[PDB]
């Protein structure tokens, strides 16, 4: 059951590149596509993310998309650059200028058919295509505008397949342009309708974790992406290694999404790395549920957990893992909804990540995520009430109504999260 990976834009390709860098190491595959591993657990579910070529070389089932060639070239020359299929690079020259409209309506519309051709040829060779995962930002133009265009086109062609995204939410604390709330609000409207699962990765949380916890005074995007690729590896551990819980994308969606529109997740990782003493099972459980280890910049105590998925990596006792998981929810049961019995499911994997002997990745569908969309909504309205910077978008053919609709739909999403926070 194969997954097709797509990375779009500057952020999506840089984060996507680190992700393939991390999991290729976990599966014992060198930058030349050859396998030099020590355990058959590495190859047991390798087909989920890698195709096979003659000579027992493994090619990632990844498609690199961008409207300017800059980041594409950087990925091709960086580490693990030549592991990617050469013709799976689809890029233009104009760029999108941090403009959702340019990515979604004009510049990206000229390029989307080329991408769907690569998506089609990758899907046609799949034994039983499980679904798609997309990495992108919502604050730019290509990953935001063209990314959500791709999702809409892919859903039209593969309507019975799971659509998954890793979506980087913008923040004024790590900002490129002031129009990021516009692009983010336009993209959320698309994600609410056309994805089954979306991991909300807030650049504000990533910065704060790098600043306060990891003691990085001047964090870079590379520092933030080290955190993203680490959680991307953790949330996909159940998909890449033998397991019983949340082993495929649809089963995870059935366990994590009680209502179709509420499919935005808070990821969390422990321990946070930028490591000689191994962490204990109580220490992993306490950290992975702490706010400081959350990637969405939302205090979970401000809302309630609809469902929670947790994975533990390394050689440990499942007894102490069950004891600690049961301890954290029996002594914080007010933060878990009572109308979804047993909404916390745990999985374990014997393969630990690189450099760590024990690790824990957290996946939460909390109503506290509304804090994220409310921040975006306030930044959106602050400019939109004065129609500020709108000409960049109306110049690409957009109408003010489309902004009013995306704004209204996201405020509904916030109100719908507040509905289930009370019971």
């Amino acid at each position: 059951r194969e997954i097709v990976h797509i990375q779009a834009g500057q952020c999506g390709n840089q984060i996507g590149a680190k992700f393939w860098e991390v999991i290729s190491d976990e599966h014992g595959i060198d930058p030349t596509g050859s396998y030099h591993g020590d355990s058959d657990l590495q190859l047991e579910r390798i087909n989920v993310y890698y195709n096979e070529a003659t000579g027992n070389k493994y090619v990632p089932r990844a498609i690199l998309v961008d409207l300017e060639p800059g980041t594409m070239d950087s990925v091709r020359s960086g580490p693990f650059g030549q592991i990617f299929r050469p013709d799976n690079f689809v890029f233009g020259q104009s760029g999108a200028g941090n403009n959702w409209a340019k990515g979604h309506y004009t510049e990206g519309a000229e390029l989307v058919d080329s991408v769907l051709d690569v998506v089609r040829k990758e899907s046609e060779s799949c034994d039983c295509l499980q679904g798609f995962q997309l990495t992108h930002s919502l604050g730019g133009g290509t990953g935001s505008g063209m990314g959500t265009l791709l999702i809409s086109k892919i859903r039209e062609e593969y309507p019975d397949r799971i659509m998954n995204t890793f979506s980087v939410m913008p923040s004024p604390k790590v900002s490129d342009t002031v129009v990021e709330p516009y692009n983010a609000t336009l993209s959320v409207h698309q994600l609410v309708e056309n994805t089954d699962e979306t991991y909300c990765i807030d650049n504000e949380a990533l910065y704060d974790i790098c600043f306060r916890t990891l003691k990085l005074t001047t964090p870079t995007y590379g520092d933030l992406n080290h955190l993203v690729s680490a959680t991307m590896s953790g949330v996909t551990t159940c998909l890449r290694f033998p397991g019983q819980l949340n082993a495929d994308l649809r089963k995870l969606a059935v366990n994590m999404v009680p209502f179709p529109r509420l499919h935005f997740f808070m990821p969390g990782f422990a321990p946070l790395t930028s490591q000689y003493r191994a962490l204990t099972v109580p220490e992993l459980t306490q950290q992975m549920f702490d706010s400081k280890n959350m990637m969405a910049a939302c205090d979970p105590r401000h809302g309630r957990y609809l469902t929670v998925a947790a994975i533990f990596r390394g050689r440990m006792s499942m007894k102490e893992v069950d004891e600690q998981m049961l301890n954290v929810q029996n002594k914080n049961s007010s933060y878990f909804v009572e109308w979804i019995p047993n909404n916390v499911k745990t999985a374990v994997c014997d393969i630990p990540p690189r450099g760590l002997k024990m690790s824990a990745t957290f996946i939460g569908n909390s109503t506290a995520i509304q804090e994220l969309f409310k921040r975006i909504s306030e930044q959106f309205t602050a400019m939109f009430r004065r129609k500020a910077f709108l000409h960049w978008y109306t110049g690409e053919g957009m109408d003010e109504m489309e902004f009013t609709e995306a704004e209204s739909n996201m405020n509904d999403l916030v109100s719908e999260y507040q509905q289930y926070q009370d019971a």
Binding site: Q244, V254, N255, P260, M318, W339, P341
Partner: protein, 440 residues
């Protein structure tokens, strides 16, 4: 000699089928290559074991079993496992993608595309039967295949094999090893669609066998292998009368006749003893009275419930090992004076006892110690309705918010089927209450 066809559906059904058929071969002396040197009638016979094994010209003894899963991983283990030579490829059926813990996806979407394949494969086994007596269906309540596809198969089996007995071995969902949050939904839906098509169903709560593995076997974190090897022992003691010479429960109809006076109330409670760890270096063998007494201890039941606060309708005692009737009678007389055994006033206070002199067989290298005598009690008590109440309550909590219902509607199922299924469980719950219950 009337043949029996076993159908294993879903991951839980298939993996338990492995544990059982492995144990069947150890009990009848069948080697992994299908050969049985004990059988001197090569190529056929009307012996008792022939109800579960057919014979080829080469002397291979082949299970009368079909394995069905909407997903190839678990069954591919069988195709390459220790008993790969036991089954022939036609008996193993695998789909492309599974039901994703969705009853509707297993019943409607994927069920429609594979139900005719499965039935035709079942017809191939049925045609080799001079007088087929029915089916034993192993599945889970919680899985989308085990719940959704089974109820569809049980509907068609009643159509193609009219008034042929169908017995279930159903795995009740327990959160300690469960994989899905919607298992209450799947359980209620499959119990609704299957109720009229099942003559007798044995429920095993994974919670019950999980704790038995922790307490009696001293296993820290029991795995499915631990659980299934214990389940197979219970299944073997229930099907032993169909595979060995005897006079109690020698056909599938006798299970309904002996245990099910009311057709909807066809869920007997199973209790088993003794469960002794094989790593326990020193052990003192238990008596007939001690293992019979344990049959009335909740800690040894397949479903945790209190029979003292229900009413009995029937009781079967199935012994294996060194047990003579005098020991059983002296034990039952002692137990009646010390324990609360209340029968419904219209049924007779009695026990149907069966004894098989062969002691229970244990897989070499397993967790169970070989014991000189064991007993499995099948009792149709109204106390098992506690398991329906728990399930119905969890169903009620989620459904009041319509949590997750869009997954089922998205597969073509109508929201009204939830109500129709829950109303049926309410009626079933009221039926048990009619039968078992009479500032200061």
């Amino acid at each position: 000699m009337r043949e029996c066809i076993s159908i294993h559906v879903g991951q839980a059904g298939v993996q338990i089928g492995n544990a059982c058929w492995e144990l069947y071969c150890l009990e009848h002396g069948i080697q992994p290559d299908g050969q049985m040197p004990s059988d001197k009638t090569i190529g056929g016979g009307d012996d008792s074991f022939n109800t579960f094994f057919s014979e080829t010209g080469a002397g291979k003894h082949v299970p009368r079993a079909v394995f069905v899963d909407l997903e190839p991983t678990v069954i591919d283990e069988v195709r390459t496992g220790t008993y790969r030579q036991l089954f022939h490829p036609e008996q193993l059926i695998t789909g492309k993608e599974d039901a994703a813990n969705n009853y509707a996806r297993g019943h409607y979407t994927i069920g429609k595309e594979i139900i005719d394949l499965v039935l035709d494969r079942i017809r191939k086994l049925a045609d080799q039967c001079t007088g087929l007596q029915g089916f034993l269906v192993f599945h889970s309540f919680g899985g989308g295949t085990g719940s959704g596809f089974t109820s569809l198969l049980m509907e068609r089996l009643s159509v193609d094999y009219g008034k042929k007995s169908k017995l279930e071995f159903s795995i009740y969902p327990a959160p300690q090893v469960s994989t899905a949050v919607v298992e209450p939904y799947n359980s209620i839906l499959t119990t609704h669609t299957t109720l009229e098509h099942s003559d007798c169903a044995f429920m095993v709560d994974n919670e019950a066998i999980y704790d038995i593995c922790r307490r009696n076997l001293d296993i820290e974190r029991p795995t499915y292998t631990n659980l299934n090897r214990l389940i197979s022992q219970i299944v073997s003691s229930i099907t032993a009368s169909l595979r060995f010479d005897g006079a109690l429960n020698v056909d599938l109809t006798e299970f309904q006749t002996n245990l099910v006076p009311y057709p909807r109330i066809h869920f007997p409670l199973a209790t088993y003893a003794p469960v002794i760890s094989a790593e326990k270096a020193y052990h003192e063998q238990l008596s007939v009275a001690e293992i019979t007494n344990a049959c009335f201890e909740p800690a040894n039941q397949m479903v945790k419930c209190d029979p003292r606060h229900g009413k009995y309708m029937a009781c079967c005692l199935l012994y294996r090992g060194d047990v003579v009737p005098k020991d059983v009678n002296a034990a039952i007389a002692t137990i009646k004076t010390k324990r609360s055994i209340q029968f419904v006033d219209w049924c007779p206070t009695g026990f149907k006892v069966g004894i098989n002199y062969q002691p229970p067989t244990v897989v070499p290298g397993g967790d169970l110690a070989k014991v000189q005598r064991a007993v499995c009690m099948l009792s149709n008590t109204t106390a098992i309705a506690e398991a329906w109440a728990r399930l119905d309550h969890k169903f009620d909590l989620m459904y009041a918010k319509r949590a997750f219902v869009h997954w089922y509607v998205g597969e073509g199922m109508e929201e009204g089927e939830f109500s129709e299924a829950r109303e049926d469980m309410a009626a079933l719950e009221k039926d048990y209450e009619e039968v078992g219950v009479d500032e200061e």
